[PDB]
């Protein structure tokens, strides 16, 4: 790996600089290098890893959606034939996106998840696994689509089980996991009722636990609770 010669601490330092400079591809490459040093990641480091790849794949997903929409319009009745270029370019972006997802899933499998024993780390990584399989599912149209969806589901479900046993209902990781699994249900699994039920139960159980929190923890939890509410408002 190109980062093999750089110190772990230097990779972390540079990931933080890259974030400040909004250089998310660089940030992701630095954090991949840091993971490949083989040591576990701290909370802060896990969040650097997630921010980097979320931004990279987020941009790819947005581009894929633009191109997919153009492609769909090209296959409507009355649309003039423009050749293979729209499909080709959508495929190019799609392949790049799948590559990033495979990279992230590879880091999780080699060997972040297996060494993650604390609830905070294990849930975080399993949520990531669900998320990146979800992104693969968004673009999947073939024989493996069902298996990709089931891989996302399975990762989210393991994360949910741990989070419910080991974390308070206001824990931001738990809340964010539930938010994203709810979106999985709505957008991927064709299960809007499950999505709504999960978002509502999560919100209500968090509300009941806010009284236990400091001012700063309250701020963190209520921010994510508002995202749950926003989705519920969109869906009802």
């Amino acid at each position: 790996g190109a980062m093999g010669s750089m110190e772990r601490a230097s990779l972390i330092q540079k990931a933080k600089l890259a974030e400040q400079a909004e250089r998310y591809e660089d940030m992701a490459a630095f954090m991949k290098g840091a993971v490949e040093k083989g040591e576990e990641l701290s909370c802060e480091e896990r969040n650097l890893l997630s921010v980097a790849y979320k931004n990279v794949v987020g941009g790819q997903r947005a581009a894929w959606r633009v191109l997919s929409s153009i492609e769909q319009k090209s296959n409507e009745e009355g649309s003039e034939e423009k050749g293979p270029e729209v499909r080709e370019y959508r495929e190019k972006v799609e392949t790049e996106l799948q590559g990033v997802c495979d990279t992230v899933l590879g880091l999780l499998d080699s060997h972040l998840i297996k060494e993650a024993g604390d609830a905070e780390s294990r849930v975080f990584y399993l949520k990531m696994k669900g998320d990146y399989y979800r992104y693969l599912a968004e673009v999947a149209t073939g024989d493996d689509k069902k298996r990709i969806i089931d891989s996302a589901r399975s990762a989210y479900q393991e994360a949910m089980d741990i989070s419910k046993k080991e974390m308070p209902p206001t824990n931001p990781i738990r809340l964010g996991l539930a938010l994203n699994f709810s979106v999985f249900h709505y957008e991927i699994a064709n299960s809007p009722e499950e999505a709504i039920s999960l978002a509502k139960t999560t919100f209500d159980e968090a509300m009941a636990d806010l009284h236990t929190l400091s001012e700063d923890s309250y701020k963190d939890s209520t921010l994510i609770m508002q995202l749950l509410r926003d989705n519920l408002t969109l869906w009802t």
């Binding site: 938010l179 994203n180 979106v183 709505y186 957008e187 994510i224 995202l227 926003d230 989705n231």
Partner: peptide, 5 residues
């Protein structure tokens, strides 16, 4: 699109 984190 719905919110995710």
């Amino acid at each position: 699109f719905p919110a995710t984190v």
